[PDB]
Design a protein around this ligand. Structure first.
Ligand SMILES: *[C@@H]1O[C@H](CO)[C@@H](O)[C@H](O)[C@H]1NC(C)=O
Lengths: 48, 50
């Protein structure tokens, strides 16, 4: 069972993590049923 | 989810992943109606000693 908990927070700090409290609400409970041991996030390039 | 209690209109605002609410004794004291998505408090029926 793949659980997605999510929270969106308006912040204005430049560099590091902000210091505060914000609980993440569950968004999507996703039925995959597969083995996961390694992950990788996706970024986007800018071309000019 | 079966039970017996007085149903009243509730001021609690459930998050969309929440269906019911539990009290100290884990009895359902608030419930969301599955047809019209509104919250109802469930105060128990009166108990007395005769
Ligand atoms: C039927 O149920 C859905 C959610 O369960 C609700 O959004 C909808 O208003 C209901 N239809 C009627 C006619 O009440």
């Amino acid at each position: 069972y793949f659980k997605i908990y999510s929270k969106h927070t308006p912040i204005n700090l430049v560099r590091d993590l902000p210091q505060g409290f914000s609980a993440l609400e569950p968004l999507v409970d996703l039925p995959i049923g597969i083995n996961i041991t390694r992950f990788q996030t996706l970024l986007a390039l800018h071309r000019s | 989810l079966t039970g017996t209690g007085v149903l009243t209109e509730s001021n609690k605002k459930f998050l969309p992943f929440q269906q019911f609410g539990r009290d100290i004794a884990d009895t359902t004291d608030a419930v969301r109606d599955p047809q019209t998505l509104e919250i109802l408090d469930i105060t128990p029926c009166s108990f007395g000693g005769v």
